[PDB]
Symmetry: C2
Subunit: 55 residues, 2 copies
């Protein structure tokens, strides 16, 4: 819903695609977001196993 | 032979195509000049007619 596609949650997340984008937003009068594809990849599913004796 | 295609002979001759070019030379590691087409258009051919009586 927001735009995190620039990866704002850390400024450490900038790639030239963002930079390419900025230079285009300078030379551009207008833009369209044509498609946005998100792909999650799960390398691991890790629970914390809690072994509890009393106290 | 030189590059006047940017229109250097006057700084008054810049169009966004030059500006577009500069922004691309920033985000680019390298370039090729693929084709250069020059077209002259002659709107007029005008000589100075010199009518000379003696002195």
């Amino acid at each position: 819903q927001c735009i995190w596609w620039r990866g704002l949650q850390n400024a450490a997340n900038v790639n030239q695609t963002i930079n390419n984008m900025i230079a285009l937003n300078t030379i551009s009068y207008g833009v369209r977001f044509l498609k946005a594809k998100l792909c999650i990849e799960v390398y691991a599913v890790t629970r914390k196993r809690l072994i509890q004796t009393g106290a």
